Structures are given as structure tokens and as C-alpha cells.
Paper text:
Carbamate kinase (CK; EC 2.7.2.2, ATP:carbamate phosphotransferase) reversibly converts ADP and carbamoyl phosphate into ATP and ammonium carbamate. The enzyme functions in the L-arginine dihydrolase pathway, operative primarily in some bacteria but also in the enteric protozoan parasite, Giardia lamblia. CK assembles into homodimers, consistent with the oligomeric form detected in solution. Each subunit contains an eight-stranded β-sheet surrounded by three α-helices on one side and four α-helices on the other side of the β-sheet.
An AMP-PNP molecule binds to each of the four subunits within the crystal asymmetric unit. AMP-PNP binds in a pocket flanked by amino acid residues 11–13, 235–250, and 267–278. It exhibits the same interactions whether CK’s auxiliary domain adopts the open conformation or is disordered, as the nucleotide does not interact with the auxiliary domain. Of the two homodimers in the asymmetric unit, the auxiliary domains of only one homodimer adopt the open conformation while those in the second homodimer are structurally disordered. The following interactions are common to both structures. The loop comprising amino acid residues 245–250 undergoes a conformational transition upon AMP-PNP binding such that the side chain of Tyr245 (Tyr238 in efCK) stacks against the adenine ring and its hydroxyl group forms a hydrogen bond with the ribose O2′ hydroxyl group. Met275 (Met268 in efCK) side chain stacks against the opposite face of the adenine moiety. Present in glCK-AMPPNP but absent in the efCK-ADP structure is a hydrogen bond between the O3′ hydroxyl of the ribose and the carboxyl group of Asp237 (Gly230 is the equivalent residue in efCK). However, no electron density is associated with Mg2+ in the glCK-AMPPNP structure reported here. We therefore propose that although catalytic activity requires the presence of a divalent cation, the metal ion is not required for nucleotide binding in the active site.
Author numbering:
A (entry chain A), B (entry chain B): 1 to 132, 164 to 316
Amino acid sequence: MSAGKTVVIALGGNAMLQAKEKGDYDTQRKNVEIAASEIYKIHKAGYKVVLTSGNGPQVGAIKLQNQAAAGVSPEMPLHVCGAMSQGFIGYMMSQAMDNVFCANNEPANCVTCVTQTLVDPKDQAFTNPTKPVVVPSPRPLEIVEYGVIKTLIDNNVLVICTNGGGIPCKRENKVISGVDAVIDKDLATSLLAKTLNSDYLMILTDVLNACINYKKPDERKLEEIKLSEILALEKDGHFAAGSMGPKVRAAIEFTQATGKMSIITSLSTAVDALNGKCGTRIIKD
Amino acid sequence: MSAGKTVVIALGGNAMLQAKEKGDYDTQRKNVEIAASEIYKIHKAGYKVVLTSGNGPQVGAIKLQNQAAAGVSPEMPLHVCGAMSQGFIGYMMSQAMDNVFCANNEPANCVTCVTQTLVDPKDQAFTNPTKPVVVPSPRPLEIVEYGVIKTLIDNNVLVICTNGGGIPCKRENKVISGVDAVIDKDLATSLLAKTLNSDYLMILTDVLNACINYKKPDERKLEEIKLSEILALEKDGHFAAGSMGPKVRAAIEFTQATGKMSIITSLSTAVDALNGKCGTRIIKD
Ligand SMILES: Nc1ncnc2c1ncn2[C@@H]1O[C@H](COP(=O)(O)OP(=O)(O)NP(=O)(O)O)[C@@H](O)[C@H]1O
Ligand SMILES: Nc1ncnc2c1ncn2[C@@H]1O[C@H](COP(=O)(O)OP(=O)(O)NP(=O)(O)O)[C@@H](O)[C@H]1O
């Protein structure tokens, strides 16, 4: 209801695929349902929820489909593939969230918004690509649908958006047009959440704590931790540029900007980390 | 713009494709641009708008790729293809819409919602496919996201949804799951329009008017017609079940339920029909 604080939640790969699980519909559905049970608890606890996710495996599969049917069907550019993946992913999360609602005798009240994320065309990353092949991962500037998203949470709708970090776009002399690229879903969710001026940013992943000296002897799992300690641990290089790196960067940005707690944890214990009982919680300088 | 009347607008195939055009992204993009101009005028005129469309060619192209690559990537079902066509199409309309707002120096305020539509899973169509090769077309019973759509127009947001008629679904024992149909985009929009209790239902196509004796020596283009008169015209069988039939069905039902007017016109004379100056306009007795 209306009284509730807002928490912005970024699901990871494990909301749809477990390690070595294959990309079929029913397998992914089962994962989302499970994933939706954890989320419902957060909404039941009285929190206002905005859901986000990644789309890597899903958009890759679509792009896999568009390339291998090229002779029988026109081949869509990456950014459009991104788009079909939002309908796909959105659909699933929409459906599952409604089903967990009804299961609890609460009338369904959530939706999925196609989302476009503007990026700077003059981004360095256009000129030094990454993961497949070869493709930019530019910083998110703006969530184009931000305004409607705020309207929806101001009305206590459970909003699902930015799945995959948003459809990458640019605006040049008043024209938005899609670009061929990908955006880190976590940076994108930091972006939304600070604009929303949210009360929390949660990044949900498969590990229950960020660590330093990760997979190593003197390993240490981060718990509740101050902004300055994590800023220092980051330049120390503890976080991997392809996994944990963006997340911490995501959490650090949002906490720096709003003073509000950001959280990294297992999808399986989301509510506990909110209640203070575990997970890496970055708090305020 | 909290003062404007509401018009539910159902776009047709030509929002994205002209006679014998190729299902590629740029060919459909620029078609959508053209529709977006027409729509903007309506919005500029002061009306609240809900935007709908069909998806046949697009879901078809998607359903096509999923089989052409069923040996590289896993093959998705019909309703998930639907959810993919929705992301993609909604993407195009979203971006085009936003671009035309910017071109008029007006701040963007538009959204595409992923949409589900409940149907009875033992509808007669699951016993005799019969929609254009002939396929099913079950009767739409519920737009799941109705509540959020309602909310979104109450806030004067320009809402795009039920693209392609909505992802076909059904709800057994508190569980919504996807069926493998396609819904008539016009019936579905009639449902929404009358649930929203809109001031207008408008179905935009590639002909200026519904006719009787179509393409036949004594062809009468219908203009402004009371509901009783068009009921009796329909029963006689002037409206081919492939094309105009369900459009008139949709108009009739909407007007029978609300007493407000429905419309069938060409996409580019939409504002004129609203100004009473043309097009088939069905009204109450
Ligand atoms: N310093 C670290 N602490 C904890 N885990 C780490 C660290 N560095 C790398 N990792 C790994 O990062 C993994 C989680 O990130 P990741 O593989 O990207 O999953 P995800 O982000 O939830 N999915 P997705 O959003 O689809 O990319 C963990 O399983 C760890 O294996
Ligand atoms: N009695 C009739 N009067 C006028 N047009 C008719 C009639 N009967 C059939 N038609 C045709 O129906 C066509 C419109 O419907 P249709 O061909 O299905 O396109 P659409 O419904 O606008 N697209 P979509 O949203 O993808 O289903 C017109 O172009 C007419 O050629």
C-alpha cells in the first residue's frame, strides 16, 4: 500500500537459468515462479517494488535465432532482439508475479514496461567493444520511461522494467533511434533507483555476500559495511570486472548519491537482508 | 490534459506494413513513424489515447524463426512468440511516439505495457482453427493488466498495449498459464475499450469505410449508422469473416455496451472521423 518505502530490485541470471540449465520455456518459467515467491514476500512485508533483470542468455538466444533463420526471414538488429526479449522476460515475470499474488488472495496489480535506455554516442565503449564477436557496453544516461515508472509506483503498482538494462538508444537532434549494444543491467538499475530517489537498491545474485579475497585463503565475506571501506576495497581490485565489479559499482553509486542503503545478496534470502539479518549491506558516509 | 475524452484506437496491419513490403526492421519502423503522426494529432487535439495493434505478420515472422532454428536454439511456443512480438512492436510505437512528441517540443509521456488476455481454453476455436491457411481465434474474456491501464490513463499517460490482441492465456485454479492461440486484435480492443468505459472505440484500417456489397455492382459505403441498422446488415452477411466481420463485431459490441460511438476508417483520416466528417460511424439507437 501507500505507506510503503520503495525498493528497487535487480534480479540476476539465476532468476531464469541455474548453472548448466538449458534455455527452454518451461525451465525458465519454473525459475521465475520461484524467483517470484521471494519477491512477493518483499511486497507482503509492505514494501513498494520495482523489478529489473538481465537478459544475456535470452537475448543471445533470440540473436541466435535471428542469425540462423536469416535465409528464410529478415534478420533483426541486436537492439530489436533486445526488445523481443523484454516482452519475453516481462511476460514471464508479469505472469508469475500475478500468480503468486492470486495464490495469496491479493488482487493482481503489476505490469511490464518496455524500456529504452539512452546512452552517450560519444561513449568510449563504442570504440573498445566487449563480449559476444564485438559490442559496446556504454554507461546508461537516462531511462526514457522513467516518468511513467514513477507514476506507476506512486500508484503502488508493482513495476517490472529495464529487463536487460533497457533497449540501448541515442538521441541526436531530437530523434531517439536504437543502437547495437548492451548495457549492464545493474548500472541501469542504479540509474533508475537514484532518479526514483528510492529507499533501497537491491542487487540479487547467486552468492549471498560480496567478498574480498574471493575464492582464496584469507577470504572475507562482506556484511554491513561503510561506504568508505567498500570504496577502498574496490580500488584494491577485489571485485571481478565481469561479475561482481559492476554490482559493487552499482551499489556504491546509489549509496553515494542518495545516502540510502544498497544491498548485494542471494535471491534466496532477499527479505532477510532487508531486515538486517545477512547479505552485503553498504551504508552511509 | 486531464480534461480530455478517451479514445481506444486499434491500429491495423498497415501501421507496420504496406501491400507486399518486406518484414524488415526499417520498413516497419518508417510505417510506424507515419502512424505515429496521425496519432499525435489526436493527442494534440486533446483526447486521451490508448493504442492497440495487430501482430500477425510479426508473430508469424517470429514463429517462423523459432522453427528455422529449432536445431540451434530451443524453440519457443506460440504465446511466447506473441510476448516477443509485443516487446518488439511496442518498442517501435514507443520510440516513434516519443520522437513525434519531441518534434512538437512536448515532453515524452508514453508507455508500452506487456499484456495478457484470458480466454476459455475449450472455446470452439480449439476445436476448429479458422483465422487467416486457417488458424484459431478464441474469444477474449479478460485483459489482465486492465487495472494498470486504467490507472495509466487516469494519469494522462499515452498507453500502448494489447499489441496483437494480447498474449493468449487462461486461468485454472488460481493459475494463469499461456495457451497457444492468437486473439483478434479488434475484439480484444473492444473488450478493453468497454471495460475502460471509453468515449470512443476506433478501429483504423486500410479502407475509408465499411461497405455492404463490397466490390459488387451496388456497393454502399456505410457512413453514419444507428446500431439496429448495422446489426441487421451484419446478420445478412455483408462482412467477410476474415477482415471486416470481426471489426464490425467489435464496433457493435462496444456500442451495445457503452452507448458511445465506434468507428471504422482509414488510418490517415482518423481525426476527421472523430470530427464527424467521414468514415463509418456506428452510434446508439
Ligand atoms: N568479489 C566477489 N565476491 C563474490 N562473488 C564474486 C566476486 N567476484 C566474482 N564473483 C562471482 O560473481 C558471481 C555473480 O555474478 P554473475 O555471474 O554476473 O551473476 P548475475 O550478475 O546474478 N547474473 P546476470 O545479471 O544475468 O549477469 C558469483 O557467483 C561469483 O562467482
Ligand atoms: N464489407 C467490407 N467493407 C470494406 N472492406 C472489406 C469488407 N470486407 C472485407 N474487406 C476488406 O477488409 C480489409 C480490412 O481488414 P484487414 O484486411 O483484415 O486488415 P487489418 O484488419 O486492418 N489488419 P490486422 O490488425 O493485422 O488484422 C479492407 O482492406 C477491405 O479490403
